[PDB]
């Protein structure tokens, strides 16, 4: 495997960079874009979360099936790119305006667009670039690394211009979409090893898919709902609130750089240890961050606990693909990824963010993070025995 003169490592490494630059404007700062610029209810954000969740649930199963049926022809990435070129006009001239007139129909329009391009589109891109990673002899983690930077780079640009011009970032995101098209243009890309839908749906009957989904629902989904309200919990440690955000801003921007660095070596790390132990290590880092937040009391301790995310992501993202390709027929890589790690997480996410949200109000943040911390730690150790692989003690 080579990287410097690997044309497609750069075309798709960059593709990760600019794609996640685009989504960086949308996702990490979505709550402030809604409440601060469009003056939207929090009554209504639950309607937006529901719309995206509902259309994501529909898109992600088909994205996986089409991803495998298409294999590497990359016809769907051409489609996603075309929709991201409207990133700016959609947010500025469609989503915002429509939601202020009537929120419910802005949520269907936004639920469809965002559920397509990001909630399902990002896993679909990752799944495709992983296939390319096997053909063009470069590790998937080394190309995904780029996305961490593009995500961080965009987080920096929006913080600087928040005071100046809020629309600038969205227009750049559209420009990034045309960068993606150019890269997609120049990226280079009777058989019963090919994808067949009939046998794709018999994946449900196998039990290692169920226990993989159990890990996703029990660990990854619990962790993702913990991170949804962690931003406000982070700033509550700061008396100033303006420095609470700016410290938050600094940790996300430069923390993502550490994420990329850990992910540079994560393929080599994960190749020697199991793909299973990569997930259990990821689940272990997940659980420690959650539980640690309930006992945290200090501004420093949560800067640490927010930096822990950067250690977890590389072993969960690189590890999950190593686990899927190792223990399932790799013609079903994308199907397995977008059904187990996306659809089931997104389905569980609906029910456990109401259970998470309802505990924040009954008991404290600390008590709430203690509960989820044990659900995540419990299902992480259940899967020390349940997932299929070497295991932790093989290394002693």
């Amino acid at each position, epitope marked *: 495997m080579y990287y410097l003169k690997n044309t497609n490592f750069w075309m798709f490494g960059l593709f990760f960079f600019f794609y996640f630059f685009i989504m960086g404007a949308y996702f990490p700062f979505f709550p402030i874009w809604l409440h601060d610029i469009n003056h939207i209810s929090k009554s209504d954000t639950w309607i937006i979360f529901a719309a995206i969740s509902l259309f994501s649930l529909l898109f992600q199963p088909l994205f996986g099936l089409l991803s495998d049926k298409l294999g590497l022809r990359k016809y769907l990435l051409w489609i996603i790119t075309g929709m991201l070129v409207m990133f700016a006009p959609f947010f500025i001239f469609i989503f915002g305006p429509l939601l202020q007139y009537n929120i419910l129909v802005g949520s269907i329009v936004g639920g469809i667009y965002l559920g397509f391009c990001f909630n399902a589109g990002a896993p679909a891109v990752e799944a495709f670039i992983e296939k390319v990673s096997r053909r063009s002899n470069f590790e998937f983690g080394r190309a995904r690394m780029f996305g961490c930077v593009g995500w961080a780079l965009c987080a920096s640009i929006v913080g600087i211009m928040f005071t100046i011009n809020n629309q600038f970032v969205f227009w750049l995101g559209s420009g990034c979409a045309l960068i993606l098209a150019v890269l997609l243009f120049f990226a280079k890309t009777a058989n019963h090893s090919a994808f067949s839908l009939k046998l794709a749906l018999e994946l449900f009957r196998q039990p290692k898919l169920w226990f993989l989904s159990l890990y996703v629902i029990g660990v990854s989904c619990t962790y993702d709902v913990f991170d949804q309200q962690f931003a406000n919990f982070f700033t509550s440690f700061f*008396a100033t609130g303006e420095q609470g955000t700016r410290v938050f801003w600094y940790v996300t921007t430069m923390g993502e750089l550490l994420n990329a660095s850990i992910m540079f070596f994560a393929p080599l790390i994960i190749n020697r240890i199991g793909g299973k132990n990569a997930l259990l290590l990821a689940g272990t880092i997940m659980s420690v961050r959650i539980i640690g937040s309930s006992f945290a009391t200090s501004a420093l301790e949560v800067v640490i606990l927010k930096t822990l995310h950067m250690f977890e992501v590389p072993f969960l993202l690189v590890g999950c693909f190593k686990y899927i390709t190792s223990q399932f027929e790799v013609r079903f890589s994308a199907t397995i990824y977008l059904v187990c790690f996306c659809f089931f997480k997104q389905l569980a996410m609906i029910f456990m963010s109401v259970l998470a949200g309802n505990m924040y109000e009954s008991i404290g943040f600390q008590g709430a993070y203690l509960v989820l911390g044990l659900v995540a730690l419990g299902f992480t150790l259940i899967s020390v025995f349940t997932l299929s692989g070497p295991g932790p003690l093989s290394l002693l």
Partner: nanobody
Amino acid sequence: QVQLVESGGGLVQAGDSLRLSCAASGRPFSNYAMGWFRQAPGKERERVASINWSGTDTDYADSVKGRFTISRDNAKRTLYLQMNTLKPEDTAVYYCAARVGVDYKYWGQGTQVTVSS
């Protein structure tokens, strides 16, 4: 959602201390960083002091940076403002306020504080 009831205000002579309190009703007090604001006639509302949920960090305006002390008791869900060596300039309505993100998203009715020259 959250109710804040300020108490302890009054009228005092220049140089004396006065402690104010704020009753936190509703959602968990521990989940919110809080601050005190004041509003005098013919002047803009200013933040006097803020404090995180635990009490580990406190920020005071330079106008009262040395005199006032902001306290909280999350077991008793109350938020205090000790005010020492008060001056007639410090005569205003003092408000209790809860912070979510950067926005202070809940207020109390306020307690009037009057200082004689």
